[PDB]
Structure 1
Amino acid sequence: GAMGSMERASLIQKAKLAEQAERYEDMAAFMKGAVEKGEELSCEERNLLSVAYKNVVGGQRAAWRVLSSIEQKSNEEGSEEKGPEVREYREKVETELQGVCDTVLGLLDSHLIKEAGDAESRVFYLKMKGDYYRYLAEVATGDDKKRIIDSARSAYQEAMDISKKEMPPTNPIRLGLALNFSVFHYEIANSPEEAISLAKTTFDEAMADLHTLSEDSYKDSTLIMQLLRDNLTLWT
Structure 2
Amino acid sequence: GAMGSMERASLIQKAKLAEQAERYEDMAAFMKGAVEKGEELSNEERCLLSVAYKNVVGGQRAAWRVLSSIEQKSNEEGSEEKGPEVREYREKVETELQGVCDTVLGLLDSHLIKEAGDAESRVFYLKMKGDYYRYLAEVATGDDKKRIIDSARSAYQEAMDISKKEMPPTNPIRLGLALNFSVFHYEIANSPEEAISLAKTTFDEAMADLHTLSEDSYKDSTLIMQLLRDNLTLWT
Same fold (TM > 0.5): yes
Structure 1 outlier segments of 4+, above 3 Å: none
The whole-number CA distance in structure 2 between the counterparts of 1:10 and 1:59 is 26
Q: Which residue of 2 aligns with 1:28?
A: 28
Alpha-carbon displacement from aligned partner over 1:181-224 (angstroms, at most 9, x marks no partner): 00000000000000000000000000000000000000000000
Give the TM-score of the pair, scaled to structure 2. Answer: 1.00
1:178 deviates by: 0.3
1:91 deviates by: 0.1
SS in 2 for 1:82: coil
The whole-number CA distance in structure 1 between the counterparts of 2:95 and 2:89 is 10
Alpha-carbon displacement from aligned partner over 1:71-91 (angstroms, at most 9, x marks no partner): 000000100000000000000
Q: Which residue of 2 aligns with 1:54?
A: 54
Q: Which residue of 2 aligns with 1:10?
A: 10
The whole-number CA distance in structure 2 between the counterparts of 1:225 and 1:143 is 37
Alpha-carbon displacement from aligned partner over 1:29-78 (angstroms, at most 9, x marks no partner): 00000000000000000000000000000000000000000000000010
Give the TM-score of the pair, scaled to structure 1. Answer: 1.00
1:11 deviates by: 0.2
The whole-number CA distance in structure 1 between the counterparts of 2:200 and 2:19 is 34
The whole-number CA distance in structure 2 between the counterparts of 1:142 and 1:235 is 29
SS in 2 for 1:181: helix
Alpha-carbon displacement from aligned partner over 1:152-190 (angstroms, at most 9, x marks no partner): 000000000000000000000000000000000000000
The whole-number CA distance in structure 2 between the counterparts of 1:29 and 1:129 is 18
Q: Which residue of 2 aligns with 1:159?
A: 159
Q: Which residue of 2 aligns with 1:224?
A: 224
The whole-number CA distance in structure 2 between the counterparts of 1:110 and 1:152 is 18
Runs of 5+ unmatched residues, structure 2: none
The whole-number CA distance in structure 2 between the counterparts of 1:83 and 1:61 is 23
1:143 deviates by: 1.0
Alpha-carbon displacement from aligned partner over 1:77-117 (angstroms, at most 9, x marks no partner): 10000000000000000000000000000000000000000
Alpha-carbon displacement from aligned partner over 1:116-139 (angstroms, at most 9, x marks no partner): 000000000000000000000000
The whole-number CA distance in structure 2 between the counterparts of 1:193 and 1:58 is 26
The whole-number CA distance in structure 1 between the counterparts of 2:15 and 2:37 is 15
SS in 1 for 2:41: coil
The whole-number CA distance in structure 2 between the counterparts of 1:146 and 1:57 is 21
Q: Name the Cα RMSD after superposition.
A: 0.3
Q: Which residue of 2 aligns with 1:93?
A: 93
SS in 1 for 2:156: helix
Q: Which residue of 2 aligns with 1:145?
A: 145
The whole-number CA distance in structure 2 between the counterparts of 1:38 and 1:131 is 23
1:25 deviates by: 0.3
The whole-number CA distance in structure 2 between the counterparts of 1:47 and 1:110 is 18
Percentage of pairs with the same residue:
99
Q: Which residue of 2 aligns with 1:182?
A: 182
1:142 deviates by: 2.0
Q: Which residue of 1 aligns with 2:208?
A: 208
The whole-number CA distance in structure 2 between the counterparts of 1:195 and 1:150 is 16
